[PDB]
């Protein structure tokens, strides 16, 4: 089921299970147990941008930015806010902002 205009989603590759946030909201300190650390694709709504971290709590500027529909292949080596090239395909935290 596709992300709304003002919502961003990660989706388990293996199971199809979705975790979504409206624009203006972030995850807990960690994603819930039922998605944390599963390989995902991003489905970000037209007005939304998904911020992922590979660590808990969107921490140490280990943050990557995703818009539209992104497959995990294209999330393995992404320039983070901190200038490192990280893998966000198995995220531990998330925020959704306006694109």
């Amino acid at each position: 089921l596709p992300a709304k205009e003002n919502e961003g989603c990660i989706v388990s590759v293996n199971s199809g299970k979705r975790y979504c946030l409206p624009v203006g909201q972030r995850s807990g300190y960690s994603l819930p147990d039922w998605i944390v650390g599963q390989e995902v694709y991003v489905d970000s709504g037209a007005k939304a941008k998904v911020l992922l971290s590979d660590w808990d709590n969107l921490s140490y500027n280990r943050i990557g930015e995703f818009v539209g529909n992104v497959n995990p292949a294209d999330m393995k080596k992404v320039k983070a806010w901190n200038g490192q090239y990280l893998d966000f395909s198995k995220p531990r935290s998330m925020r959704v902002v306006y694109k």
Partner: peptide, 10 residues
């Protein structure tokens, strides 16, 4: 500054 983490308590 950037968000931080802490070690899990026992």
């Amino acid at each position: 500054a950037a968000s931080t983490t802490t070690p899990a308590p026992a």
